Design a protein around this ligand. Structure first.
Ligand SMILES: CCCCCCCCCCCCC/C=C/[C@H](O)[C@H](N)CO
Ligand SMILES: CCCCCCCCCCCCC/C=C/[C@H](O)[C@H](N)CO
Lengths: 249, 42, 249
């Protein structure tokens, strides 16, 4: 009772005279599954003998692929980005030597206990996905699914995770979407005593079944901090090279 | 412009008669048009 | 894609044994068109010779039928009340004499100019409904329609007509619904000079085609002010008579 509830004989045609061109040019190499399914360095883990970085033989690497400029700029072409990842860990000595050392990679999802020591009880990995591999073995390759609570990963989060007043002490929470932090990637030398080899674990990550949504401008400034679009303000460089004059090349 | 091109509208059943704005309604009301004085000494 | 958008052999039967009674008792006299279609005094207009009430031979009686207790209590049994009215004006001398005097009743709806004098130009009544009648004639009877902008007249308006902050100076606007004030009822003696007779115009009003909606408690206190439920607080009387004791009559 309411009723209100391939060139042929701007497509090259309107500008010049054209011949017929049979364009047998495949577009399959410009897809996301072609542009992004290439493993790039997203993490390097140092396990030295005398250094103060990870002196106890264990390390907790927070999963943040924005630590290296190449893959960060590749994935940051978009905001929303849903994919499965092929994670490869190339463990080696800092001199490149392949030493007979056994390591334990362990995926520690958010909420799972980060190991506080090399001999921590979190290394029993009764539920956590963990990889046991020697350095003499080929690099450990694992298929990582799309694990975000969101429908896509989000390299740019214009907002704050929590409510309440956002002071300068809580300003670091800006842009930190917890749909993207997926816990830590924990590495140890499997043993009670300290490993006799300095070790470097290089994480190489290849994304498969890639879906990306919203293209943004690329990164024309030097990256400074992970998960942060901060740029050197006093040294802003142009997007490309310059010219002495505009009438010349 | 019939209320549609300016706002969002609901359906209104306008049972509003226009019979009182006709000339036979606005003008068929007797009004003073003349006063005639017939005094004794004026 | 959402799918969310007459006694026979408590009706006298469960308490006593009953015989069959053919109840040929009509209910037609308890209808609104029977209880309310009886003309009652709703207005008295004084046009004296030497008094200061209406000494100039004209009077502007604001249409307010809550001035006399009988009809006010009758209509105030309900809040919302839509009817057409049969208005009768019995003009007479204050001694009851029928004098050869010609009067002009004039209905002045809201917005129409209230006459400021007996010889006002508002008495030309080119659009206003007006009655010309002598006192020797029978009382002037006119059929008044349902003229409210509302769907019913409203003897109780729990609210204010205007917006803004309602101070004690604007407290008299409480209960004054402008759907009920329908201008003034203007009476004059038709002539340039003062009428030689003191005159009393008694307004008797009978409502026809009555529709009333919401029954309230009746008026058990003495009325004091028109369109106002005010009562004498220091002299509140009970609804009925009293008893010396409850075990006796
Ligand atoms: C056994 C090892 C399993 C390794 C599991 C790795 C989880 C893969 C999640 C990658 C999704 C993006 C991670 C974080 C995104 C960005 O670096 C920042 N948070 C956004 O700027
Ligand atoms: C030629 C004479 C025409 C007379 C026209 C009289 C208009 C009749 C309107 C009666 C409706 C109610 C009037 C006012 C209601 C109450 O007295 C108070 N306003 C509410 O308490």
């Amino acid at each position: 009772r309411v009723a209100d509830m391939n060139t042929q004989v701007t497509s090259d045609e309107s500008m010049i005279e054209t011949r017929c061109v049979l364009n047998s040019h495949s577009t399959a190499e410009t897809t996301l599954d072609s542009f992004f399914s290439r493993a790039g360095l997203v993490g390097e883990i140092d396990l030295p003998l005398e250094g103060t970085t990870n002196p106890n033989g264990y390390a907790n690497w927070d999963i943040d692929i924005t630590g290296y400029a190449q893959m960060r700029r590749k994935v940051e072409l978009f905001t929303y980005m849903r994919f499965d990842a092929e994670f490869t860990f190339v463990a080696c000595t800092p001199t490149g030597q392949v030493v007979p050392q056994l390591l334990q990679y362990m995926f520690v999802p958010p909420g799972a206990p980060k190991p506080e020591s090399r001999e921590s009880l979190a290394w029993q990995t009764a539920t956590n996905p963990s990889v046991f591999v020697k350095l003499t073995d080929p690099p450990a390759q694992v298929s990582v699914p799309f694990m975000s609570p969101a429908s896509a990963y989000q390299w740019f989060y214009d907002g704050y995770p929590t409510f309440g007043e956002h002071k300068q002490e809580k300003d670091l929470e800006y842009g930190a979407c917890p749909n993207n932090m997926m816990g830590t990637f924990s590495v140890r030398t499997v043993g009670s005593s300290k490993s006799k080899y300095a070790l470097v674990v290089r994480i190489y990550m290849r994304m498969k079944h890639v879906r990306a949504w919203i293209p943004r401008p690329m990164r024309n400034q030097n990256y400074l901090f992970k998960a942060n679009p901060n740029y050197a303000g006093d040294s802003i460089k142009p997007t490309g090279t310059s010219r002495n004059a505009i009438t010349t090349l």
